[PDB]
Amino acid sequence: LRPSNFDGYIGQESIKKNLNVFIAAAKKRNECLDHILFSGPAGLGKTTLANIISYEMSANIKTTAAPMIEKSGDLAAILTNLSEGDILFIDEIHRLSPAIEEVLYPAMEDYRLAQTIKIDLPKFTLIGATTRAGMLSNPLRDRFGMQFRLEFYKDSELALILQKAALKLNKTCEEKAALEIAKRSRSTPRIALRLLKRVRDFADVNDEEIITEKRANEALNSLGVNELGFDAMDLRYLELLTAAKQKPIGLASIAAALSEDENTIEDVIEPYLLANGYIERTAKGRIASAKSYSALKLNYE
Amino acid sequence: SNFDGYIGQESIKKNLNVFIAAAKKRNECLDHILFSGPAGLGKTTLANIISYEMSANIKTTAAPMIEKSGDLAAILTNLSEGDILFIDEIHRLSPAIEEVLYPAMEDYPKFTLIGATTRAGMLSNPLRDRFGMQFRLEFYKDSELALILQKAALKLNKTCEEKAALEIAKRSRSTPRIALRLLKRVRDFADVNDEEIITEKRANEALNSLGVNELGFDAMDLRYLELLTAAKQKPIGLASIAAALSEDENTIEDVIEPYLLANGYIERTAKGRIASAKSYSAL
Ligand SMILES: Nc1ncnc2c1ncn2[C@@H]1O[C@H](COP(=O)(O)OP(=O)(O)O)[C@@H](O)[C@H]1O
Ligand SMILES: Nc1ncnc2c1ncn2[C@@H]1O[C@H](COP(=O)(O)OP(=O)(O)O)[C@@H](O)[C@H]1O
């Protein structure tokens, strides 16, 4: 119950505009698209886009995950069982063992991969998805003709997503209700769609089909969903920088303080904060903007 | 490809022509070679050219594909005195497999080993010193990429204006693979408009739509330059730079600076690094 095409795909204007151009070209050229790479925080709709592309390209799609692959031959086998034009979608692609990753390079670039060698290749489209762009090797990303980084969603964009999704659940989510759920969804369709199913449940027990703002708030507060959508980690990060004065803190310190991986801070914890203008990456470390100070004060009132 | 109309790597080409001549002049195959440099600059291409010049077979493999002994022993046994063995990510080998390689390279069926690595400073002196020839591929000049792009464009049935090739060159971080990749994206913008001639206007539209940096910089390349520029040319050492960018030193010299040096954005001096005059002009 996710969008099936671009016809009414919400958000990612930039990615959509470009995919539309490359999709026209490939078809005009009577060929399949070059390899595509999607990167960005979980639940932003990259698995979705992958399947939309399969529909737009009237091509079949096969899915798998990096950890799911282990034996080098296994991958070689996967390639062997693909019809000319198909799409191969690998999620968490950044977790491929150098060995497997080494077998993939020639498959993408050339379409060919006792003693023995041989083995040609049908000619397909490899779509890779990662939530850890920083962990992706240059030899691998530089082989994707197309590279797209999903951005977070505006509250107005989530609103629409909720309104349409609500409809499929046989419910009318008023605008003001959509905006309030979005407000606590941390600009992420998955969280918002999750909260929607909870608000619905309150509507059901009250024999209601129209989710109002008032009832949305009832549900959200009753569940204790943070009013601003912050995680425990968002609060810890902002408190760490806000605790320090307008003096930048580098990963070395931050990572050390939050006893967390240095890469997890850049590609998982910070993306949302930077997106909503809570922090900035200065020339020598990070700093918290006015948003943070006023946001935190507001959260603890 | 075979050196005839080869673009770039002037010095490597110059030196290889001499060694290939001397080698053949004495009916022998080249000694072991080591190609060093960031990904996508042309190590594999050069290896193939050598295979053609020496008119010999070439077998490709990588360190991670050689797990434990049995793997390596099998590859060498299936060689043929004069053949060429190309091993990628060679600095990724274990001391055990690395130990089994030292002898074969020196003791031996005379063959030629070509090692490739993107981390020269990551490779050990003992192994490095056993490759008769050592070459550090260098980044390409705008004009060189432009010409390369124009040639690829022809194969893609399209004429690429000089200004259009340079623009792409500029944002392709002086790297053939990136350049080529961006060319195909621009080809698409051309197709949609029924254009056979890739113009600068169309190029910008594409590069900008995709959000490719104007100078092909990373988030790192910018902080690094902001760090050095702010220093008003008072030399800074690695230790300081390593801390400020929360980055490992080898990555700075081995992966980040190489490109910045090549395009004259920074300078290496006895007392440290400084932002060049060229970086004070552009923003
Ligand atoms: N742009 C979008 N428009 C509508 N729904 C979206 C959009 N992006 C994501 N979603 C929804 O959010 C959920 C998570 O999407 P998914 O593609 O699984 O994200 P990811 O692949 O990043 O984990 C899905 O139910 C999907 O329908
Ligand atoms: N000197 C060159 N002239 C034209 N194209 C080049 C040149 N060097 C590299 N390329 C192109 O860039 C890509 C990188 O080739 P490769 O040798 O695999 O780079 P590396 O092995 O260093 O990653 C290839 O598609 C190749 O066509």
DSSP codes of every residue in A147-188: EEE--PPPHHHHHHHHHHHHHHTT-EE-HHHHHHHHHTTTT-
Neighbouring CB atoms inside 10 A of B274's CB total 19
CA proximity to A238, closest of A271, A279, A276? A279
Concatenating the DSSP letter of every residue in B89-147 gives SGGG--HHHHHHHHHHHHT----EEEEEES-GGGS-HHHHTT-SEEEE--PPPHHHHHH
Backbone gaps in chain B, preceding residues (C–N over 2.5 A): 108
Question: Which residue spans of chain B are classified as CATH 3.40.50.300?
Answer: 1-140
Fold classified for B216-283: Arc Repressor Mutant, subunit A (1.10.10)
B123: left (phi over 0), alpha (psi -120 to 50) or beta: beta
CA torsion sign, A41 to A142 to A251 to B117? positive
Of 3.90.1150.10, 1.25.40.10, 3.40.50.150, 1.10.8.60, which CATH number belongs to A154-228? 1.10.8.60
What gap in Å lies between CA B221 and CA B228, rounded to an integer?
A: 11
Q: Is ligand 1 within 6 A of the CB of residue A42?
A: yes
Cβ pair B40:A138 closer than 8 A: yes
Which of B58, B185, B208, B224 should we substitute to test contact with A (largest number of A Cβ atoms within 10 Å)? B185
Structure letter (DSSP) for residue A46: H
**Per-residue tokens: B146:** 């432009």
A143 touches chain B (CB under 8 A): yes
Spatial neighbors of B207 by CB under 8 A, at least 6 apart, are B167, B168, B171, B182, B186
> Exposed, middle or buried by CB within 10 Å (0-12, 13-18, 19+), for B21?
exposed
Cβ pair B189:A262 closer than 8 A: no
Question: Which residue spans of chain A are classified as CATH 1.10.10.10?
Answer: 229-301
Instruction: Give the atom of ligand 1 at the shortest distance from the alpha carbon of A51.
Output: 17
Q: Which of B44, B45, B60, B61 is catalytic?
A: B44
Fold classified for B141-215: Helicase, Ruva Protein; domain 3 (1.10.8)
Cβ pair B187:A99 closer than 8 A: no
DSSP-derived pairing of the beta strands B133-136 and A279-282? unpaired
What gap in Å lies between CA A109 and CA B261, rounded to an integer?
A: 29
State the Cα torsion B47-B48-B49-B51 to the nearest 10°. Answer: 90
- At CB < 8 A and 24+ separation, what contacts does A97-100 make? A97/A70, A97/B64, A98/B62, A98/B63, A98/B64, A98/B89, A98/B92, A99/A72, A99/B64, A99/B65, A99/B67, A100/A69, A100/A70, A100/A72, A100/A75
Provide the b/e sequence for B258-272 (b: ≥16 CB within 10 Å): bbbbbbebbbeeeeb
Q: Are A181 and A199 in contact (CB under 8 A)?
A: yes
A262 alpha carbon to ligand 1 midpoint, in Å? 27
Q: What are phi and psi of A87, to 5 degrees?
A: -120, 135
What gap in Å lies between CA B272 and CA B283, rounded to an integer?
A: 23
Cβ pair A72:B65 closer than 8 A: yes
**Per-residue tokens: A84:** 């000319």
Spatial neighbors of B276 by CB under 8 A, at least 6 apart, are B264, B265, B266, B267
Q: Look at domain A229-301 and name its CATH class.
A: mainly alpha
- Mark whether B118 is an active-site residue: yes
Distances from the Cα of A168 to the Cα of A2, A3, B94, angstroms? 10, 11, 56
Backbone gaps in chain A, preceding residues (C–N over 2.5 A): 113
Q: Which of B83, B112, B117, B118 is catalytic?
A: B118
What gap in Å lies between CA A26 and CA A32, rounded to an integer?
A: 6
Q: Is ligand 2 within 6 A of the CB of residue B8?
A: yes
What gap in Å lies between CA A114 and CA A268, rounded to an integer?
A: 47
Three-state DSSP at A120 gives coil
Structure determination technique employed: X-ray
Q: What are phi and psi of A282, to 5 degrees?
A: -70, 180
Question: Which residue spans of chain A are classified as CATH 3.40.50.300?
Answer: 1-153
* Mutation test residue for ligand 2: of B45, B48, B49, the one with most atoms within 8 Å of CB: B45
Question: Which residue spans of chain B are classified as CATH 1.10.8.60?
Answer: 141-215
What gap in Å lies between CA A104 and CA A188, rounded to an integer?
A: 31
CA B259, distance to chain mean position in Å, is: 10
CATH of domain B1-140: 3.40.50.300
- Mark whether B117 is an active-site residue: no
CA proximity to B277, closest of B263, B268, B262, B266? B266
Nearest protein CA to atom 9 of ligand 2, as residue = B42
Q: Which amino acid is at A82?
A: L
What gap in Å lies between CA A37 and CA A24, rounded to an integer?
A: 18
Neighbouring CB atoms inside 10 A of B202's CB total 20
A47 alpha carbon to ligand 1 midpoint, in Å? 7
Question: Which residue spans of chain A are classified as CATH 1.10.8.60?
Answer: 154-228
From A7's Cα to the closest Cα of chain B, the distance in A is 19
* CATH architecture of structural domain A1-153: 3-Layer(aba) Sandwich (3.40)
State the Cα torsion B229-B230-B235-B239 to the nearest 10°. Answer: -100
CA proximity to A99, closest of B100, B62, B98, B43? B62
What gap in Å lies between CA A174 and CA A159, rounded to an integer?
A: 9
Q: Integer distance in angstroms from the first to the last C-alpha of chain B? A: 40
What gap in Å lies between CA A192 and CA A185, rounded to an integer?
A: 5
What gap in Å lies between CA A90 and CA A183, rounded to an integer?
A: 32
Enclosing H/E stretch for B233: none
Nearest residue on chain A to B117, judged by CA atoms? A139
Q: Integer distance in angstroms from the first to the last C-alpha of chain A? A: 39
Enclosing H/E stretch for A85: none
CA proximity to A60, closest of A50, A47, A69? A50
Question: Which residue spans of chain B are classified as CATH 1.10.10.10?
Answer: 216-283
B239 touches chain A (CB under 8 A): no
